Design a binder for this molecule. Sequence first.
Ligand SMILES: O=C(N[C@@H](CO)C(=O)O)c1cccc(O)c1O
Ligand SMILES: O=C(O)c1cccc(O)c1O
Ligand SMILES: O=C(O)c1cccc(O)c1O
Ligand code: NA
Length: 175
Amino acid sequence: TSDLIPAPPLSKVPLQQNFQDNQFQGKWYVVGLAGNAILREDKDPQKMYATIYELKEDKSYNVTSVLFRKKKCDYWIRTFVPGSQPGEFTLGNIKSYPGLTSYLVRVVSTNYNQHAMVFFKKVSQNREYFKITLYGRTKELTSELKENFIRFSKSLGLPENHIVFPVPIDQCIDG
Ligand SMILES: O=C(N[C@@H](CO)C(=O)O)c1cccc(O)c1O
Ligand SMILES: O=C(O)c1cccc(O)c1O
Ligand SMILES: O=C(O)c1cccc(O)c1O
Ligand code: NA
């Protein structure tokens, strides 16, 4: 059994105009996490992790997430293949992910040098998951940018306790 808030129609998820894939390269800090499978948990509040976007020759991203767990750095690697329009992506080598039938990425907004919002949607074991990452070039962002991320997360149907801001750490995500 699993109950999920439904994934929003793509109509409610903006696309960043004139997406410069080269300027989106590099390290982003996950300053905000929201989604139908994300839950606030004050026992072990979630530690901040980072995701690095590196373009290849074929303009796909090698996407490496690095995070700190069990006293070690875990490295989660996958490829984002360019999608229907610039700033939109799909997951490469989907068959290597057991249960995974669908994966969409959409860069909602960014200024490239400070902040970014990315929308993800996946269907795994037939369950439709979606999430929104508040990307920060640094570990801290303005309260306006954070409130806008709360604003946008709610516009897609998520309640407050499904919107989390991971606490900054220094292990692994530097550098
Ligand atoms: O909600 C997600 N994942 C949770 C459970 O699958 C998680 O926290 O791992 C989730 C949703 C869209 C895309 C993803 O990469 C993703 O991990
Ligand atoms: O499980 C996670 O926390 C996670 C981290 C980075 C990237 C992902 O897709 C994840 O599901
Ligand atoms: O949990 C996973 O293994 C997973 C698989 C495919 C894509 C993801 O984002 C994942 O977190
Ligand atoms: Na991420």
